């Protein structure tokens, strides 16, 4: 599947988003293939094995 | 109704063997309220006396 | 009139024109150079690109 | 064995001068013959020349027609090269009008010999035949020397035109309603048994089917009548050992879009025949079956 | 009963060799000759007792 | 996330991640040359008008 | 028309994991059939999967597999597969998909797979509720006895009580060829076996009415005069005298 952490670490470009229905709805109604949401601050990004 | 004769008269309309499988497969209902409906004992008896 | 009734359904096909709309740079379409495969049918050579 | 030597692309013969030119370049002699370019040098078709007497040339001047050898007894005329059309007079499938039509066309002692040698033998027809391929380049003389293809496409010299297989319309049959993109042609003799003689009925059955088992399974469908008549003759007559009831041999293939009607035109005698156009010949063999 | 039903409803003798029934069980041959002259076009209806 | 009031549960931040994918769709076009067309294209016979 | 193509390009639609395209790189030069035989095929028509049905019959597969165009995979890569249609009489390597080991000089046959039973391969290449089933290539003797077992199952099925048929099918399906065991996946009596029942009983009964008086009598003549191990078991199958 899609590795996530390296997205939270690799310098990302940054773009004005636009999706009708608050992003959480389009993440909840499976608009995109792969997705994940975490609420607090997952310390998984700091682990680099 | 005469126009429908080509489908009202087909044997698959008049044989319930396919229907009996689907009816027997599920079996009796589990609900207590259906239980009064469930039980009746047809019992063959000789006509001598 | 026999005891039952009928409820015929009937699908109908309509030839139709359709107006699509699509935004600027909605998709990238990456391409390579076309390649030409060749076959020999003793009587002719068809190529595909 | 050098690394470059395996690295070289394969060398096509046209890139090298002709072997005769390779000798003439070395020795510089110049004959009247034009060996600068060799004809018939690109021919996947394999071929053979057959001398056929002038009594059998009719309806074969048109390129594309089966050649079938026919062994008969007498050591002097060891064989004889029947067309598919000439065999139609004996077939029971053919229309009586078509049969009496084309039977007039074979009014020669050489061809009438074929009817006599067909009647002569007790043993079954399918045994005596061996398909040879298809006509092209009729030599057309007092005695035609027909060129016959054993394998590959039928076409002109110089590939200027593609000869087409012609199959008389009464023999042509199709089992299926939805033709495939490619379909194989098989020749099918089918004996239907009867008292004085088991009369044959010839057919040519194009079909996308290739597997033998599925092919014979679909074949017994239409031929159930002949098969049951064979079984009935099997019990009707004791100490009679009649064998197979149809026989199928793979005759080649065609693309199934090429198929369309036509007519042969000879002696001002139009003859309706189905016309496989780019019919590649790939001979098989007679396969006995019940 | 089958003779009298086929003659009444107007469809008769749809008998196909067993090699062909096995093929129809999958491919479903187009076993309907079209009208001699269709002035309207494609047609269909269904039926629910 | 907007700040919450007194007596109301607050909003934990929510990182979201999604992924788009490419879709493959190639095309093919055959053109055929008869062996007669190729044989005159290269070979030349006695040069005659 | 355009003549039948020798090289055929297959394109997948579903997203291919970097793990799974590696299965096809190890799947190169396999025997994969297609029904269609066009130049630019879909992935849906690859392999045997499209012919799976609710009937769950093995003989339906044996029958529909005979008609399919066998192709040998070639030059696999991301975004592309290049199936090749072999020509008759020309040599080719053939990858050994099935567990059966191949003796030198043995002929090969194409039959739908016969799962081992307890275990199945993980690298199915399932995607989008589309599994990649491919026909097994087996030596000829195993492909003979699998069909002999299937036909005996079809002949014994009739004229026998349904409980007896369970005991027979429980064993007719397992095959110990070459020290490996195999099991026919859901062999089922059907119409597809029924027509073969008819043709086998017809040919085998017309055989009985063709052997000469001496041809049948040869075994009796042999046992009364000479004996060996082969003849002991043939004396057994002859029921009584």
Relative to beta strand F15-19, strand A34-38 is: antiparallel
Per-residue CA distances from G220 to D40, G81, G209, G224, G240 (Å): 65, 62, 18, 6, 11
Taking CA atoms, F29 is separated from C36, E1, G128, in Å, by 10, 58, 29
**DSSP string for A1-49:** ----HHHHHS---------SSTHHHHHHTT-SSEEEEESS--TTTT---
| Chain F residues in contact with C30 (beta carbon < 8 A) | 22
DSSP result, D239-285: T-----SEEEEEEEEE-SSS--EEEEEETTEEEEEEEESS-EEE---
3-state helix, strand, coil in chain G (%, to 5): 35, 15, 50
Query: What's the CA gap between G125 and G76, in Å, rounded?
Result: 15
Q: Is G10 exposed, middle or buried (0-12, 13-18, 19+ CB in 10 A)?
A: buried
Whether chain E lies against chain B with 3 or more Cβ pairs closer than 8 A is yes
Which chains does chain G touch, 3 or more C-beta pairs < 8 A? C, D, E, F
Measured CA to CA, the distance from residue G212 to residue E24 in angstroms comes to 42
Q: Name which of D13, D38, D42, D159 to mutate to probe chain F: the one with the most chain F Cβ atoms within 10 A of its Cβ.
A: D159
φ and ψ of G195, to 5 deg: -65, -30
Contacts of D157 (CB under 8 A, 6+ apart): D39, D40, D137
Cβ-contact D273, D260 below 8 angstroms: no
> What span, in angstroms and rounded, lies between the C-alpha atoms of D212 and D284?
12
Cα D40 to chain centroid distance, Å, stands at 22
Contacts of D44 in chain C (CB under 8 A): 42
Which tokens is D146 given? 């027909």
Those residues whose C-beta lies under 8 Å from the C-beta of residue G32, and which sit 6 or more positions away, are G46, G47, G70, G71, G72, G73, G83, G134
E19 closest CA partner among D238, G194, F44, A15: G194
CA nearest to D144, candidates D76, D79, D50, D48: D50
User: Residue G174 — φ and ψ, nearest 5°?
Assistant: -90, 135
d(CA D254, CA D206): 8
Determine the distance in angstroms separating the CA of E5 from the nearest CA of chain C, rounded to an integer: 18
Which region holds residue C10: left if phi is over 0, alpha if psi is between -120 and 50, else beta? beta
Mutate to test the interface with E, among D174, D180, D217, D227 (most CBs of E within 10 A): D217
> How many residues are given for chain B?
49
E strand or H helix that includes residue D134: strand D129-136
Give me the half-sphere count of Cα atoms (radius 13 Å) on the Cβ side of residue E29.
Answer: 17
Interchain CB distance below 8 Å, E48 and C4: no
Residue D37: its chain F contacts at CB < 8 A?
A: 43
Q: Any chain F CB within 8 A of the CB of A12?
A: no
Q: Which technique was used to obtain these atomic coordinates? A: cryo-EM
Q: What angle do CA G104, G106, G107 make, to 5 degrees?
A: 145
DSSP 3-state of D166: strand
Tokens of G180: 């490996």
Angle at D138 between CA D135 and CA D144, to 5 degrees: 110
User: Cβ contacts (< 8 Å) between D220 and chain E: which residues?
Assistant: 19
Q: Name chain E contacts of B9, Cβ cutoff 8 Å.
A: 5, 8-9
Interface membership of C40 toward G (CB under 8 Å): no
CA angle, residues D247, D252, D255, in degrees to nearest 5? 125
Dihedral of alpha carbons D153, D157, D158, D160, sign: negative
The data reach a resolution, in angstroms, of 3.6
- Inter-chain CB proximity C43 and D155 less than 8 Å: yes
**Do the Cβ atoms of F35 and D159 come within 8 Å?**
yes
Strands G7-11 and G40-42: parallel
Give Dmax (Cα) for chain E.
Answer: 37
Half-sphere exposure of G8 (CA within 13 A, CB side): 26
Q: Is D220 on the interface with E (CB under 8 A)?
A: yes
Give, for B6, the enclosing helix (H) or strand (E). helix B5-8
Among G2, G15, G40, beta carbon nearest to F26: G40
């Amino acid at each position: 599947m899609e590795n996530w952490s390296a997205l939270e670490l690799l310098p990302k470009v940054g773009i004005p988003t636009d999706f009708l229905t608050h992003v959480k709805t389009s993440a909840g109604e499976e608009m995109f293939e792969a997705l994940r949401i975490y609420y607090g601050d997952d310390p998984e990004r700091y682990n680099i094995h | 109704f005469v126009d429908a004769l080509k489908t009202l008269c087909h044997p698959v309309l008049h044989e319930p063997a396919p229907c009996l499988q689907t009816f027997t497969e599920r079996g009796p209902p589990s609900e207590p309220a259906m239980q009064r409906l469930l039980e009746c004992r047809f019992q063959q008896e000789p006509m001598g006396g | 009139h026999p005891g039952f009734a009928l409820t015929a359904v009937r699908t109908d096909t309509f030839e139709v024109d359709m107006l699509l709309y699509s935004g600027k740079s909605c998709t990238s379409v990456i391409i390579n150079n076309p390649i030409v495969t060749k076959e020999e049918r003793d009587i002719s050579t068809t190529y595909h690109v | 064995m050098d690394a470059r030597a395996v690295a070289k692309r394969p060398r096509d013969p046209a890139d090298e001068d002709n072997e005769l030119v390779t000798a003439l370049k070395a020795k510089r002699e110049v004959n009247t013959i034009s060996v600068r370019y060799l004809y018939h040098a690109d021919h996947q078709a394999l071929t053979a020349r057959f001398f056929v007497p002038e009594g059998l040339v009719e309806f074969e001047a048109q390129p594309g027609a089966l050649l079938i050898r026919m062994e008969t007894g007498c050591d002097s005329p060891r064989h004889l090269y029947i067309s598919l059309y000439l065999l139609g007079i004996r077939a029971s499938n053919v229309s009586a009008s078509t049969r009496c039509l084309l039977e007039s066309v074979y009014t020669a002692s050489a061809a009438r010999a074929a009817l006599q040698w067909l009647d002569l033998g007790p043993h079954l027809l399918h045994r005596r035949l061996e398909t040879l391929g298809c006509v092209k380049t009729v030599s057309l003389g007092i005695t035609s020397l027909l060129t016959c293809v054993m394998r590959g496409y039928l076409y002109n010299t110089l590939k200027t035109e593609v000869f087409a297989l012609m199959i008389p319309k009464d023999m042509y049959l199709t089992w299926e309603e939805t033709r495939g993109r490619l379909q194989y042609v098989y020749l099918i003799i089918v004996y239907d048994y009867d008292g004085p003689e088991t009369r044959p009925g010839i057919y040519v059955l194009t079909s996308s089917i290739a597997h033998w088992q599925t092919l014979v399974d679909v074949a017994r469908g239409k031929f159930a009548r002949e098969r049951c008549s064979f079984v009935n003759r099997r019990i009707t007559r004791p100490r009679q050992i009649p064998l197979c009831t149809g026989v199928i041999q793979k005759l080649g293939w065609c693309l199934a879009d090429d198929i369309h009607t036509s007519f042969l035109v000879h002696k001002e005698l139009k003859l309706s025949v189905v016309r496989l156009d780019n019919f590649s010949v790939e001979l098989g063999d007679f396969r006995e079956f019940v | 009963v089958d003779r009298w039903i086929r003659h009444a409803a107007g469809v008769e003798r749809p008998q196909l060799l067993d090699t062909e029934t096995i093929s129809m069980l999958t491919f479903g041959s187009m076993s309907e000759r079209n009208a001699a002259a269709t002035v309207h076009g494609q047609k269909a209806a269904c039926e629910l007792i | 996330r907007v700040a919450s009031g007194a007596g109301l549960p607050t909003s934990r931040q929510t990182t979201i991640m999604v992924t788009k994918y490419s879709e493959k769709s190639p095309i093919t076009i055959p053109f055929e040359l008869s062996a007669a067309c190729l044989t005159y294209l290269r070979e030349t016979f006695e040069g005659t008008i | 028309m355009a003549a039948m193509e020798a090289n055929i390009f297959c394109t997948f639609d579903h997203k291919l994991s970097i793990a799974d395209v590696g299965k096809l790189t190890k799947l190169v030069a396999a025997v994969v059939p297609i029904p269609q035989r066009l130049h630019l095929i879909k992935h849906y028509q690859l392999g045997l999967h499209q012919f799976v049905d609710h009937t769950r019959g093995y003989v339906r597969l044996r029958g529909l597999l005979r008609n399919m165009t066998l192709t040998l995979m070639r030059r696999v890569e991301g975004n592309q597969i290049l199936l090749h249609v072999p020509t008759h009489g020309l040599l080719y390597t053939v990858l050994n998909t099935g567990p059966v080991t191949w003796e030198k000089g043995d002929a090969l046959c194409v039959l739908p797979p016969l799962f081992h039973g307890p275990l199945a391969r993980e690298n199915l290449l399932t995607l989008g509720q589309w599994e990649l089933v491919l026909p097994w290539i087996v030596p000829m003797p195993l492909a003979l006895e699998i069909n002999q077992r299937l036909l005996i199952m079809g002949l014994f099925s009739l004229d026998r009580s349904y409980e007896e048929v369970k005991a027979a099918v429980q064993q007719l399906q397992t095959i110990t060829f070459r020290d490996a065991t195999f099991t026919i996946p859901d062999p089922v009596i059907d119409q597809h076996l029924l027509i073969d029942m008819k043709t086998a009983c017809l040919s085998m009964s017309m055989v009985a009415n063709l052997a000469s008086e001496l041809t049948m009598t040869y075994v009796r003549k042999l046992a009364l005069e000479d004996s060996s191990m082969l003849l002991v078991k043939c004396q057994e199958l002859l029921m009584r005298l």
